[PDB]
Ligand binder design. Structure first.
Ligand code: ZG9
Length: 514
């Protein structure tokens, strides 16, 4: 695909991927690059930095404030008042001023922008955070946290109960709790009233409370999380903690009867001798249609239609894709169509894995379901490719240096036989070092480097009251924390479907090392 032919396709991640391929091979000239912004679906990350080696953007500054950016720390007192206030939106700029000018500006702004005044005078002290915390300036607090994460201080009950009202609070709480940073902030957040938080914030504050062995406060946070969470899966995670902490048997019962299939509801079913949830069975009699499952542009198109279809239009697409050849698209449509109420665990291109042992089949399928929902031409925002969502670098190393496939191209990852084969091969390497399918999942998504670093710590996946569940809440990258939970549920299910059942309790026991 030449740049001219790509330009005649709709904007999409696939079109981006292919533009990126031209760029990394140095095939986009300065002239081709001129009209190219408008041809990129998602102008973020690698494709942006690559295009910018060819055509910098010096942008962007609002024509109105242009003259404000002609001043520096040394001339800011010569600027009009509007220009003065615009420049003071940057804490680095404020930090750069000398203290006499911070004093002068603080007076200028006392009446109309006391927020600026507080930051100006704060930077005249040796601890600006302490000054801001004494004023209980909430906006100031978050601006300082965003400026530097190194500030750490005890916060009293009144102040910490004000933080949750700011949009920055949820990321602030999450970051410092899962990174184990800012201990004085963390300890202080024990005194946040559960009434003042909800949803993810409440949940993280429950995890925080467990790390300090405040199990009652933890129960109260998790219970507020349970009552406010929008998604049933997250609600289940909170109900699980409520149960582990207090062992009210109504909590476990509610979790065992959840409509969401996840590790918590599966475990609850197993603890209460409740039957395994019903898994749908999709077996279309019709064998093929016109659709090319190997065309990534056709997937981007159909995917957009499916996501924008009303309750009614799905039914038309369901019927059209009700074939063996488009099984992955059928199940994808059905999953949306039934508003996530039914459980679909398909096994497409099964011939390519039927000779592996069943445990290996389940792990493969478990990864694929989460990675791509088995869409052969799936492309991620980082341009991970195919059913098993290989990054190009690893695909080329396996494809070219290890397996030496003749005329290998990274787009071979779009073929099911290749995806399953490379997945099997990579999963072999991970399993041999890590053993648990959870740990393999973490390493598959996040790399074996971060997984090995997490498992070398003395406070992760070791023995303890609430292990291994607590450790699973403190996995330091959000995407990997989530990924491992979802893939582990998938794994349990597929082991069951393949008549190679395991108790999820056995999985959890083998996460604790000594
Ligand atoms: C937390 O999981 C990380 C993986 O998420 C996948 O996204 C899930 C999607 C949602 O859309 C339908 C298919 O499943 C990513 N896959 C894609 C195509 O973006 C995957 O790359 C990522 O590792």
């Amino acid at each position: 695909y030449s740049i001219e032919k790509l330009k005649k396709e709709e904007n999409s991640l696939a079109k981006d991927y292919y533009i990126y391929r031209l760029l990394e091979k140095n095939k986009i000239s300065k002239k081709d690059a001129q009209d190219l912004n408008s041809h990129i679906f998602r102008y973020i990350g690698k494709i942006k930095s690559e295009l910018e080696k060819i055509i910098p953007l010096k942008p962007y500054i609002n024509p109105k404030y242009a003259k404000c950016y002609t001043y520096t720390a040394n001339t800011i007192l010569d600027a009009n008042l509007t220009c003065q206030s615009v420049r003071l939106n940057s804490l680095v700029f404020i930090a750069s001023l000398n203290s006499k000018d911070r004093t002068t500006l603080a007076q200028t702004f006392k009446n109309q922008r006391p927020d600026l005044t507080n930051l100006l005078l704060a930077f005249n002290t040796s601890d600006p955070m302490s000054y801001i915390v004494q004023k209980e300036d909430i906006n100031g607090f978050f601006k300082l946290y965003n400026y530097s994460k190194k500030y750490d201080l005890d916060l009293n009950t009144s102040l910490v109960n004000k933080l949750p009202n700011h949009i920055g609070f949820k990321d602030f709480a999450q970051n410092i709790i899962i990174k184990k940073e800012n201990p004085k902030f963390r300890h202080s957040m024990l005194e946040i009233n559960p009434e003042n938080v909800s949803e993810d914030s409440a949940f993280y504050l429950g995890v925080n409370a467990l790390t300090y062995d405040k199990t009652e406060l933890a129960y109260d946070f998790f219970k507020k999380a349970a009552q406010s969470f929008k998604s049933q899966s997250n609600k289940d995670n909170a109900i699980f903690w409520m149960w582990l902490i207090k062992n009210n048997e109504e909590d476990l019962k509610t979790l065992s009867q959840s409509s969401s299939l996840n590790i918590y509801s599966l475990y609850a079913k197993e603890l209460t001798n409740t039957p395994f949830p019903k898994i749908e069975s999709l077996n279309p009699s019709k064998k093929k249609n016109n659709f090319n499952m190997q065309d990534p542009f056709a997937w981007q198109k159909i995917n957009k239609q499916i996501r924008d279809a009303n309750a009614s239009q799905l039914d038309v697409l369901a019927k059209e894709f009700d074939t063996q050849e488009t099984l992955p698209i059928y199940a994808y449509i059905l999953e949306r169509k039934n508003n996530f109420k039914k459980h679909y665990f398909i096994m497409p291109y099964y011939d390519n894995i039927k000779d592996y042992n069943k445990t290996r089949q389940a792990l493969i399928l478990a990864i694929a379901r989460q990675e791509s929902r088995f869409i052969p031409t799936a492309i991620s925002v980082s341009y991970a490719l195919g059913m098993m969502q290989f990054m190009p670098f690893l695909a080329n190393h396996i494809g070219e240096k290890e397996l030496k496939i003749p005329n290998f191209d990274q787009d071979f990852m779009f073929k099911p036989e290749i995806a399953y084969y490379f997945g099997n091969y990579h999963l072999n390497y991970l399993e041999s070092r890590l053993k648990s399918p959870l740990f393999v999942a973490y390493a598959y998504n996040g790399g074996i480097g971060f997984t090995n670093r997490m498992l070398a710590r003395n406070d992760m996946f070791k023995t303890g009251k609430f292990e291994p569940f607590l450790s699973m809440e403190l996995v330091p990258y959000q995407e990997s924390r989530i990924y491992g939970k979802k893939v582990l549920a998938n794994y349990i299910v597929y082991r069951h479907l393949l008549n190679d059942s395991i108790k999820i309790s056995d999985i959890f026991e083998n996460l604790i090392q000594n």
